[PDB]
Amino acid sequence: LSLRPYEFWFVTGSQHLYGEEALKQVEEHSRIMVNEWNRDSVFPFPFVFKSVVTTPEEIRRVCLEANASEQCAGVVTWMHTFSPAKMWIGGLLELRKPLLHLHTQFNRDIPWDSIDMDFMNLNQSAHGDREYGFIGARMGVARKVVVGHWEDPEVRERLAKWMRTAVAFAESRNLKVARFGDNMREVAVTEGDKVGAQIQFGWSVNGYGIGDLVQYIRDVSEQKVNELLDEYEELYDIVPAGRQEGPVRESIREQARIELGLKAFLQDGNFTAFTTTFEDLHGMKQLPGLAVQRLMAEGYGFGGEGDWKTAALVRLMKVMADGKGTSFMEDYTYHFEPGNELILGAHMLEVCPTIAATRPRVEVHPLSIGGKEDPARLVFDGGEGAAVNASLIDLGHRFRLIVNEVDAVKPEHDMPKLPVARILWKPRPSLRDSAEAWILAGGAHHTCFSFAVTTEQLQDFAEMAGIECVVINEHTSVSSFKNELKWNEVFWRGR
């Protein structure tokens, strides 16, 4: 589910005070920085050099163009010299693309024996970026700030992680969610304000009768179903009974029809996320299962039981992660063994095979929920390692993003009677404390779990979106966490 071309504009500020020769050297430096940066494979997207800006209208022009350019996912600004910040007011007012303020310098060291006034006039980011820093503070602008020399690999790393965040934000602002049916009845956390979320994030969330999907599934080519099956047998282990013609293989075939119909519906409307609900499956043979797991592996967002917030979150985290190690997730049951406390996570069917440590198996088991026929699904153990588990909730007047850092662990025991894929994790700082903190913050039971997305990225995304992000990790004291929820509540009110 690939992306349109994206690029990041590098805008360098200066002034006319020091003359045209100085301005020539500023351009020279910026053009070199961009070219060298584009040689480093750490960057997942290209920088594009933009002509040095020195006047209010040049600044405003480049910001206007950045706004209109569909490929521009972010603007990186840097003051090479002093660049009087009132000139930047008009541009900053126009800019709606994500902004990163790079506070850097062309040379690494001070040339002690040669440094003169010309050098002082030229390489003065030391103060140019501070005057620019003030107008940003003064206008209350959303920004990432990165400090360091431009060849420092740590700097390039902040830059590169940020590019994925910005590109995720670009995808978020054009994100379309299709809902097949409404929320599970009586459920609170998956409910919320779609107009509010379209205003805040850009998400478009709209509802379709399950019957619209049923028609697409009905029109699937049997030839294509059979080819998809061949692919299933190539990628996965199939339960022995499904490896021969008969009713088990047919159950699998039916998920293949569902996958192909879903995919056709979604491509037709340019949707990149979707929801289903087991309470509305008229005309469907099975709850979508294996089909959904597959579409998630292709980069589609998904939320169960009408959960559009989590479907959008899964999709944008997929973009942040470059499609790696990311899944819709739900906390299912606990292991309270002293010293070995952990969480088993799953869903009734829909867990993405990209978090699998073992080769997935296609299985068919009964599912009473929904009252439909035994669904086919992929079954596997999730892998191990550091990860995040994130929830995005609607508090009524505003949204809150909640991020728990966790450590997935390998199971020490088989779970032979368990018909769904699953993963085990130990949340930080302990199961006891993270669960209390989560509950205090009203975190959902549905989350996006990811081995790839970092907390920095989710925080930066929250900065771009203008919403609160709270983090639960190894350093969390619960009492402090309670205090921060209160202090944050007063800041984010009316904002």
Ligand X SMILES: OC[C@H](O)C(O)[C@@H](O)CO
Window 340-359: residues binding ligand X (CB under 6 A): 348
Name the binder of 139 from ligand X, a copy of itself, Mn ion, none, CB < 5-8 A by kind.
Answer: a copy of itself
Q: Of 381-420, which residues contact a copy of itself (CB under 8 A)?
A: 393-397, 413-420
Q: Which of 10, 82, 162, 236 binds ligand X (CB under 6 A)?
A: 82
Q: Please indicate if the annotation marks 405 as binding a ligand.
A: no
Name the binder of 202 from ligand X, a copy of itself, Mn ion, none, CB < 5-8 A by kind.
Answer: a copy of itself
Q: Please indicate if the annotation marks 446 as binding a ligand.
A: yes
Q: Of 293-312, which residues contact Mn ion (CB under 5 A)?
A: 304
Q: Please indicate if the annotation marks 347 as binding a ligand.
A: yes
Which residues make beta-bridge pairs with 72? 7
Distance CA 71, CA 47 (A): 11
Query: Closest approach of Cβ 229 to a copy of itself, in Å?
Result: 25
Q: Of 40-69, which residues contact ligand X (CB under 6 A)?
A: none
Q: Of 129 and 330, which CB lies nearer to Mn ion in the complex structure?
A: 330
Q: Which of 28, 32, 42, 115 binds a copy of itself (CB under 8 A)?
A: 115
Q: Of 75 and 420, which CB lies nearer to Mn ion in the complex structure?
A: 420
Q: Please indicate if the annotation marks 330 as binding a ligand.
A: yes
Query: Closest approach of Cβ 450 to Mn ion, in Å?
Result: 18
Residues in contact with a copy of itself, total (CB under 8 A)? 138
Q: Which of 171, 331, 363, 460 binds a copy of itself (CB under 8 A)?
A: 331
198 forms part of the interface with a copy of itself (CB under 8 A): yes
**129, 79 contact by CB (below 8 A):** yes
Q: Of 100-139, which residues contact ligand X (CB under 6 A)?
A: 124, 127
Q: Of 248 and 313, which CB lies nearer to ligand X in the complex structure?
A: 313
- Segment near Mn ion (CB under 5 A), from 155-163, 325-333, 450-458, 471-479? 325-333
Q: Which of 369, 386, 415, 418 binds ligand X (CB under 6 A)?
A: 369
Q: Which of 4, 17, 211, 212 binds ligand X (CB under 6 A)?
A: 17
467 forms part of the interface with a copy of itself (CB under 8 A): no
Phi, psi of 308 (to 5 degrees): -70, -30
Residues in contact with ligand X, total (CB under 6 A)? 9
Amino acid at 254: E
305 forms part of the interface with ligand X (CB under 6 A): yes
Q: Which residues participate in the annotated binding site for Mn(2+)?
A: 305, 330, 347, 446
Interacting residue ranges for ligand X, rule: CB under 6 A: 17, 82, 124, 127, 304-305, 348, 369, 445
| Residues lying near Mn ion in the complex (CB under 5 A) | 304, 330
